[PDB]
Amino acid sequence: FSRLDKVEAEVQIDRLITGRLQSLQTYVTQQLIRAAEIRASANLAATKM
Amino acid sequence: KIQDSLSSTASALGKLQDVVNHNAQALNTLVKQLSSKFGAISSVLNDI
């Protein structure tokens, strides 16, 4: 914002926010996979117990 | 006794209700999610 007009800089900040959002999505997908694996392991442990 | 025990409360059938609610909620989110602009002029193609 500090150096350019709004009309053009808003496109760049939209690019940045989209990239950050996609990175967050990737993180959450990895978390889902890990949680599913951990749930399987927890069920196995419950059966063991 | 089990017959009346099933219908006495309402949380006994939680899992199947959760499944169907999850499916419906996913569908509704998907159909509503197309109203966004994604930093464009409008969400309707024909006017664009």
From Swiss-Prot, chain B:
Q: Name the domain of life this protein comes from.
A: Viruses
What start-end ranges are recorded for coiled-coil regions in this protein?
Answer: 17-48
Heptad repeat 1, as annotated region: 1-38
User: Which purpose does this protein serve, as stated in its record?
Assistant: Subunit of the fusion protein that is processed upon entry into the host cell. Mediates fusion of the virion and cellular membranes by functioning as a class I viral fusion protein. Contains a viral fusion peptide that is unmasked after S2 cleavage. This cleavage can occur at the cell membrane by host TMPRSS2 or during endocytosis by host CSTL. In either case, this triggers an extensive and irreversible conformational change that leads to fusion of the viral envelope with the cellular cytoplasmic membrane, releasing viral genomic RNA into the host cell cytoplasm.
Protein name (record): Spike protein S2'
**Which species does the entry assign this protein to?**
Severe acute respiratory syndrome coronavirus 2 (2019-nCoV)
The taxonomic lineage of its organism, from the top, reads: Viruses, Riboviria, Orthornavirae, Pisuviricota, Pisoniviricetes
Annotated gene: S
Q: Which residues of the whole protein are included?
A: 933 to 980 of 1273
